[PDB]
Amino acid sequence: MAPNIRKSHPLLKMINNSLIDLPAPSNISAWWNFGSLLAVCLMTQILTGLLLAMHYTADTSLAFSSVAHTCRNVQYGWLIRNLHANGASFFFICIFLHIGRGLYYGSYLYKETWNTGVILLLTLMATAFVGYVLPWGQMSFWGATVITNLFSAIPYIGHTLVEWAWGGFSVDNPTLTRFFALHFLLPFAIAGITIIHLTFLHESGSNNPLGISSDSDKIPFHPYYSFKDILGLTLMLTPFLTLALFSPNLLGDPENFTPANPLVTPPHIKPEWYFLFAYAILRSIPNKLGGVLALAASVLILFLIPFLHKSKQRTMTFRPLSQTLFWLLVANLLILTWIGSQPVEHPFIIIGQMASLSYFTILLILFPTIGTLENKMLNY
Amino acid sequence: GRLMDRIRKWYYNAAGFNKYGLMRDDTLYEDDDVKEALKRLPEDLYNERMFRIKRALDLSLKHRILPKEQWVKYEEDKPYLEPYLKEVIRERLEREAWNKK
Amino acid sequence: XXXXXXXXXXXXXXPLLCRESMSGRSARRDLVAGISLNAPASVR
Amino acid sequence: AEPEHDQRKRMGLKMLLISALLTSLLYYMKRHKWSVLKSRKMAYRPPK
Amino acid sequence: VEHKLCHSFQTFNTSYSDTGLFGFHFVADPLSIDDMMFCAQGEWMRLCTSTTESEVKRAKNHLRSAMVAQLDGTTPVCETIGSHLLNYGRRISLEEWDSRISAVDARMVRDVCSKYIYDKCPALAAVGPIEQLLDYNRIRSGMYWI
Amino acid sequence: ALLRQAYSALFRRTSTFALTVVLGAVLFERAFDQGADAIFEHLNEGKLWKHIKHKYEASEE
Ligand code: HEM
Ligand code: HEM
Ligand SMILES: CO/C=C(/C(=O)OC)c1ccccc1CSc1nc2cc(OC)ccc2s1
Ligand SMILES: CCCCCCCCO[C@@H]1O[C@H](CO)[C@@H](O)[C@H](O)[C@H]1O
Numbered sequence: 103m104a105p106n107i108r109k110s111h112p113l114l115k116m117i118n119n120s121l122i123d124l125p126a127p128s129n130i131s132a133w134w135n136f137g138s139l140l141a142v143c144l145m146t147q148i149l150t151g152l153l154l155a156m157h158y159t160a161d162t163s164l165a166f167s168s169v170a171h172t173c174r175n176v177q178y179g180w181l182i183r184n185l186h187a188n189g190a191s192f193f194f195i196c197i198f199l200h201i202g203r204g205l206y207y208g209s210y211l212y213k214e215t216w217n218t219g220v221i222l223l224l225t226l227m228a229t230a231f232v233g234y235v236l237p238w239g240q241m242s243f244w245g246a247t248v249i250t251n252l253f254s255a256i257p258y259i260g261h262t263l264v265e266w267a268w269g270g271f272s273v274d275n276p277t278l279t280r281f282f283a284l285h286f287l288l289p290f291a292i293a294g295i296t297i298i299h300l301t302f303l304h305e306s307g308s309n310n311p312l313g314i315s316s317d318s319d320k321i322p323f324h325p326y327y328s329f330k331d332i333l334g335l336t337l338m339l340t341p342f343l344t345l346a347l348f349s350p351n352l353l354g355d356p357e358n359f360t361p362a363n364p365l366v367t368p369p370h371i372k373p374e375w376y377f378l379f380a381y382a383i384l385r386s387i388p389n390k391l392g393g394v395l396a397l398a399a400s401v402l403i404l405f406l407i408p409f410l411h412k413s414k415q416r417t418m419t420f421r422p423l424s425q426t427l428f429w430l431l432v433a434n435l436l437i438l439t440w441i442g443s444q445p446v447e448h449p450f451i452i453i454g455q456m457a458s459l460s461y462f463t464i465l466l467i468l469f470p471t472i473g474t475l476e477n478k479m480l481n482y
Numbered sequence: 483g484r485l486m487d488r489i490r491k492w493y494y495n496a497a498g499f500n501k502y503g504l505m506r507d508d509t510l511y512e513d514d515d516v517k518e519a520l521k522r523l524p525e526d527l528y529n530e531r532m533f534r535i536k537r538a539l540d541l542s543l544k545h546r547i548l549p550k551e552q553w554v555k556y557e558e559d560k561p562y563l564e565p566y567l568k569e570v571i572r573e574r575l576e577r578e579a580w581n582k583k
Numbered sequence: 584x585x586x587x588x589x590x591x592x593x594x595x596x597x598p599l600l601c602r603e604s605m606s607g608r609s610a611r612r613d614l615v616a617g618i619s620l621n622a623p624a625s626v627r
Numbered sequence: 628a629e630p631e632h633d634q635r636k637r638m639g640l641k642m643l644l645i646s647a648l649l650t651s652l653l654y655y656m657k658r659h660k661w662s663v664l665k666s667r668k669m670a671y672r673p674p675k
Numbered sequence: 676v677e678h679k680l681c682h683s684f685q686t687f688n689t690s691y692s693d694t695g696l697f698g699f700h701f702v703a704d705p706l707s708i709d710d711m712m713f714c715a716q717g718e719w720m721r722l723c724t725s726t727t728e729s730e731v732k733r734a735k736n737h738l739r740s741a742m743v744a745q746l747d748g749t750t751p752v753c754e755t756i757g758s759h760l761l762n763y764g765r766r767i768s769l770e771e772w773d774s775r776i777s778a779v780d781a782r783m784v785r786d787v788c789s790k791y792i793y794d795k796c797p798a799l800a801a802v803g804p805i806e807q808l809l810d811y812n813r814i815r816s817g818m819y820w821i
Numbered sequence: 822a823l824l825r826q827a828y829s830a831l832f833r834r835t836s837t838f839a840l841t842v843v844l845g846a847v848l849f850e851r852a853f854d855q856g857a858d859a860i861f862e863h864l865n866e867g868k869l870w871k872h873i874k875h876k877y878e879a880s881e882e
Contacts, residue, residue: 105678105710128664129543173631180631181638208511311542312502315512318536321664322810329657336653340646347639416511420497479493480506526673533671543664584737584744590682590702633869641857663811794833820835 120304124323127308127316133203134308134327135334139196141296142335147193148289150186151233154179158236160282162275165238166361188346190230191353194376196338197223201404206428208416209309210407214302220404222295227377227401229288232281234374235273239358244371246273246281252384255391272364313416372443379435382442386458396458403465410466413473414482423472431464491556500554501547502538505531507563515574519566527562588623680711692762697791698798705804712808713817720821723789728781735776742772794819 104110108118118124157176159168172179201223203209210216235246250273254264269276310316321327345352353375357368373381384397418424434457441454494500499509508531510516523531541547591597599605617625629635658665684701699719703711746752746769759766795818801808808814831841862869 103678105680105714127539129539173629180629180635211511310539312509312538313511314509314535314538316539318532319539320809322813325660325812325816326664326810329653329660333650333653333657336646336650340643340650343642343646344639347635347642350635414511415509420499420509422493422496422498476493479490480497481490529673530671537669540664540667540669584741588683588685637858637861640861641853644853644857660812 122324125307125320126323126327127310128319128321129310129312130308131311132334135331136196136200136203138331139335139338140200143189143193143196144292147186147189150182150189153182154186155286160279162238162278165236165278169237184346184350188342192342193226197226205407206418207309207311208313211411211416212303212306213408215299216408217405218295218299218302222292222299224401225288225292229285229292232285235278235281236285237358238278238362240360240362240368241355241358243273243362244368245373248371252390252394255394311417311419313419370445375439378442379438382438382454383458385446386455410470412470414477414480421476423476427464427468427472434461434464494556502541503548503552503554504534504538505554505562506559507561508534510563515567515570519563519570522566523563586623586625678710680707680714706807708805708808716817719792723785723793724821726781726784731779731781731784735779738776739773743769
């Protein structure tokens with residue numbers, strides 16, 4: 103048989119082959135920490151969400167009040183709401199750095215791992231989207247209104263597609279109850295796909311900053327990265343606990359303290375910060391249908407990353423041209439985040455149209471081009 | 483017109499894998515072609531490549547590099563794998579063409 | 584209780600190149616063959 | 628608007644003190660374990 | 676034997692004037708190293724923790740038969756004598772060795788082993804195809820708790 | 822030597838180690854709380870309800 107019961111036990115085995123004896127590159131950096139962060143953050147959101155859901159009432163006449171009652175009457179309910187709301191932001195911060203890492207270190211060449219990643223992102227966006235409607239504030243209702251009303255731009259099938267999703271003729275109680283059910287359900291899908299996400303990863307193991315074969319120097323996950331991750335956890339968890347316990351209402355619209363009123367449109371209907379870049383791209387195209395496509399394309403473009411790799415080397419570490427072009431894109435996304443938070447007027451309009459134009463240009467054209475141009479400077 | 487040599491030598495230094503004591507062909511991403519070409523490498527060159535890579539890996543986890551003295555010069559870089567890789571590709575292109583006709 | 588152990592790889596089978604560290608071995612008798620319950624197998 | 632105002636900041640104090648303590652301790656334990664690799668030296672010695 | 680862990684393994688207590696080297700050495704196939712090292716370190720902990728009187732009653736009998744076998748001939752007696760003076764300052768008769776050995780019990784073996792082995796940073800020499808055995812930290816953690 | 826003795830008496834055996842963690846946490850909590858509450862209350866002198874409490878009860882009503 104097998105000596106110990108750590109390599110034998112079919113339960114303790116994949117516990118062992120994933121978090122104990124799993125071979126990892128000796129030189130992966132802190133940019134490889136955000137994987138385990140997302141994992142813990144997911145388990146954190148699910149737990150804080152469950153605790154909130156045990157006091158929530160999915161009804162347009164009780165939604166706002168039930169959430170308020172949770173903060174005011176439930177023991178540490180103010181905190182659980184605080185952690186869950188800001189934890190959703192910690193999720194997106196970690197996932198944007200998780201993605202940015204892969205784009206920089208050519209991790210997308212793990213296509214199965216990468217594709218399951220994009221799907222995980224898309225499910226996360228949908229999860230945070232429907233969760234925002236639950237407190238049923240002004241920004242909740244009108245955020246749900248503006249976004250879902252876009253689907254009616256689809257020809258023929260469109261206007262029916264919307265009223266079906268609504269369960270009526272506008273966002274109302276039939277929409278809130280199904281969004282709560284959807285918000286309850288989706289995180290468990292994220293949990294499941296994560297297991298698939300990690301499964302495809304363990305096929306090839308982790309990549310490393312240098313982008314070369316790390317078989318010459320592998321170390322066990324425990325204790326090197328078991329300790330490294332926990333460090334990276336408490337390092338990242340301090341600013342957000344500071345955020346959540348000193349400036350809890352810093353990130354969110356104060357408009358969400360005014361109960362949903364379908365007869366008053368908020369002056370500036372902007373999303374949370376992690377949707378701002380996508381919101382800006384949405385409003386770049388004045389056409390309603392084109393805007394929807396441009397919005398969908400802004401995230402679905404990640405599927406085209408592996409097919410746009412033309413460089414003979416995997417990472418960007420030894421690629422100075424691709425490096426600055428990468429940081430242009432990162433700065434590009436900041437400018438988009440900024441534009442999305444601003445009204446649709448000059449000069450914000452033309453700035454947004456250019457920033458969103460360059461966003462696709464860098465990813466579709468310049469990145470595979472500069473990569474090629476680099477290869478010929480390497481004499482290939 | 484010694485411009486092309488000016489640009490290549492510039493990029494080689496700007497790349498900075500020579501700081502890790504790596505050859506140009508050390509940083510090659512191992513696709514199906516590179517993998518095959520590597521298996522054709524002589525024992526000595528292969529065992530040497532293995533050390534250079536493991537050294538670069540060890541350096542990378544230290545966040546250190548080699549002393550300026552130990553940096554691979556542009557003119558001293560050995561394209562040890564490139565002749566092998568070209569034949570591997572040439573052979574494959576033949577099969578791909580021969581399987582269409 | 585004494586004697587040094589060994590082991591080789593089979594299928595093909597699995598310190599003798601000097602004048603002195605190879606010497607002391609050139610067949611004096613013929614060939615004895617030993618095997619033990621708890622001691623390494625020997626040969627002469 | 629937020630009656631938890633006082634307790635929230637009281638927690639923020641306890642958090643920051645604990646977090647500062649724990650982050651430091653965990654940093655040592657990480658560096659301690661990784662000291663094996665961080666100091667490690669290697670040589671290439673063939674029968675050349 | 677049960678798990679085909681190694682071709683051979685030996686335990687040694689090489690003593691010097693002011694120091695020594697208590698440890699073990701084994702020869703194994705590239706893919707049986709980690710399991711072998713695992714079991715070996717386990718038995719080290721078993722020494723410091725679980726050693727029974729039944730075990731040492733055998734071990735003492737083996738060591739008795741060992742020291743006597745050590746003096747089979749003139750050369751091995753001369754070797755003992757030439758070393759006993761050089762290291763102990765005197766000759767230790769088999770009669771005296773037996774007295775020291777016969778006083779050894781399980782409680783003592785546990786203590787002495789816990790003193791030199793338990794939670795000590797060991798010295799490691801590894802030669803050959805040695806991938807399966809890796810990380811000093813893992814080996815170091817195998818030095819405590821059976 | 823505190824370091825040497827803290828090792829052999831507490832940190833060496835895994836059983837004695839765990840007991841130290843428990844015993845140490847119980848003492849740490851009792852201390853950290855009272856200290857933190859003290860640091861917070863002084864930083865807000867006369868502001869808390871426990872401070873202005875004497876005006877409306879336990880003496881006059
Ligand atoms: C809930 C969401 C996610 C979870 C829980 C998750 C989890 C993980 C974990 C634990 C790792 C290993 C540690 C690491 O490499 O950082 C990893 C690696 C990876 N993930 Fe994710 N991830 C998520 C989202 C994504 C997304 C959005 C993408 C891409 C768009 C992605 C693509 C990858 C890739 C390519 C790797 C390999 C990185 C490498 O080894 O170089 N993942 N993921
Ligand atoms: C990845 C996982 C999750 C994400 C990203 C997420 C995100 C969000 C967001 C952004 C809100 C808006 C709260 C606000 O801004 O005021 C919210 C609210 C809520 N979520 Fe989640 N959530 C997740 C998991 C869960 C789960 C698993 C449950 C229940 C089982 C849940 C239940 C709730 C409830 C009841 C609310 C209403 C409380 C409130 O509005 O603060 N959540 N969620
Ligand atoms: C119910 O609306 C939720 C909003 C939000 O920011 O949620 C966190 C919101 C509020 C105001 C204005 C706009 C929004 C949403 S903008 C947006 N929402 C989404 C949702 C997605 O799920 C796949 C994908 C892309 C996008 S872009
Ligand atoms: C790594 C993060 C650690 C955070 C530790 C926070 C501990 C908060 O502890 C809390 O403090 C409150 C204020 O006195 C008390 O009212 C609560 O009873 C107590 O549970």
